[PDB]
C-alpha cells in the first residue's frame, strides 16, 4: 500500500554529496551507486568512474567508499551497483562476455572475494539501468548468468532493472521476460506517451497497468522511477509530491499487490527540492 512505500535513489556524482549523508537521512531503502558505464568485449576488468567523485581520472580511489557502503548496509540500506546509465559506452557483448562480466561482478562487488573498485564489499544487488547501450543483445544473458551465480553460491543479492515506461522496452524486454529480476523500476519520465502531466494521470496509469501485465511474477516488485526535480526531467514527467500521493498512487492498478515504492533520479535533485522528505511526511504518518 502507499504507507509501505520504499524509496530508492541514484547516487554517484559530485553534486550528490556524500554516500554516507545520503544513507544517514533514513529516507532511502535502496541506493544505486551510479554508474559502471564502460564495459564490453575487450574490457576484461571494468573500472568504476563516478563523475567528480572517484576513479582514476579524478585521482581519488573509489575504494575509499568501502567503509561508507558497509555503514549504509549496517543501518539497513541496500546498496546496489548500477550498470549503464545515460552516458558511457556499455555492452554485454556476447554470451561469453556476459558470463565473464557476471563473474567479475560477483568476484569484485558481490562477495567480498577480492578487492575491487569499491574495495572489498558485498553489495546488495546489481541494477540494470540499460538506457543507452551500444545495443540490445545479451542483457538477458548477463541477467541469466548473474541469476545462476546466485543459485551456485545461494547468495541473497538482488537483481533489478530500470526500463523506459513504454512496454515493451527496446533494450530490456528479453531480460525482463526471464522473470529473474527482483525489482523493476519503470522510468516514467522523458516520454510523453507514458508519463504524468498536470491534470492528466491517464497515460501513467495506463502504462503502470501495462507493466503489471508484462512483469512476472505478480509480486510487490514494481516501482515508479521519477525525477526529483523539474530540472532532471527535461522531457517531462515530474510529479509534484502532493500530486504523487493524492492523484497518482491511489489510482495505480493492483496497487495493493504490485506497488513497492519509488526511485528518484537523483540524489542531487532530491536534496535540492526535498522530494523524498515530503513524500515520507505524507504517506508516512498521514495519521501519526
From Swiss-Prot:
Limits of the GH18 domain: 5-286
GO cellular component: extracellular region
Gene3D superfamilies, alphabetized: Glycosidases
Domain of life: Eukaryota
Protein name according to UniProt: Concanavalin B
Entry keyword set: Glycoprotein, Signal
Organism per entry: Canavalia ensiformis (Jack bean)
Glycan attachment points: 284
Protein purpose: May act as a carbohydrate-binding protein.
Keyword match Oxidoreductase: no
GO BP terms in the entry: carbohydrate metabolic process
Amino acid at each position: 500500500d502507499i504507507s509501505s512505500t520504499e524509496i530508492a535513489v541514484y547516487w554517484g556524482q559530485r553534486e550528490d554529496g556524500l554516500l554516507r549523508d545520503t544513507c544517514k537521512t533514513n529516507n532511502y531503502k535502496i541506493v544505486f551507486i551510479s554508474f559502471l558505464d564502460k564495459f564490453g568485449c575487450e574490457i576484461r576488468k571494468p573500472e568504476l568512474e563516478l563523475e567528480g567523485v572517484c576513479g582514476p581520472s579524478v585521482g581519488n580511489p573509489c575504494s575509499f567508499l568501502e567503509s561508507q557502503i558497509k555503514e549504509c548496509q549496517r543501518m539497513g540500506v541496500k546498496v546496489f551497483l548500477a550498470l549503464g546509465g545515460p552516458k558511457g559506452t556499455y555492452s554485454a557483448c556476447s554470451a561469453d562476455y556476459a558470463k565473464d562480466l557476471a563473474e567479475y561482478l560477483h568476484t569484485y562487488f558481490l562477495s567480498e572475494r577480492r578487492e575491487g573498485p569499491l574495495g572489498k564489499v558485498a553489495l546488495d544487488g546489481i541494477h540494470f539501468d540499460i538506457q543507452k547501450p551500444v545495443d540490445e543483445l545479451n542483457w538477458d544473458n548477463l541477467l541469466e548468468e548473474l541469476y545462476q551465480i546466485k543459485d551456485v553460491y545461494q547468495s541473497t543479492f538482488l537483481l533489478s532493472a530500470a526500463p523506459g515506461c513504454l512496454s515493451p522496452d527496446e533494450y530490456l524486454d528479453n531480460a525482463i521476460q526471464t522473470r529473474h529480476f527482483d525489482y523493476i523500476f519503470v522510468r516514467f519520465y522523458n516520454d510523453r506517451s507514458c508519463q504524468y502531466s498536470t491534470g492528466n494521470i491517464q497515460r501513467i496509469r495506463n502504462a503502470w497497468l501495462s507493466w503489471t501485465k508484462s512483469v512476472y511474477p505478480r509480486d510487490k516488485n514494481l516501482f515508479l522511477e521519477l525525477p526529483a526535480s523539474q530540472a532532471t526531467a527535461p522531457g517531462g514527467g515530474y510529479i509534484p509530491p502532493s500530486a504523487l500521493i493524492g492523484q497518482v498512487l491511489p489510482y495505480l492498478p493492483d496497487l495493493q499487490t504490485r506497488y513497492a515504492g519509488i526511485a528518484l533520479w537523483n540524489r542531487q535533485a532530491d536534496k535540492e527540492t526535498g522530494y523524498s522528505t515530503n513524500i515520507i511526511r505524507y504517506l508516512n504518518a498521514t495519521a501519526m
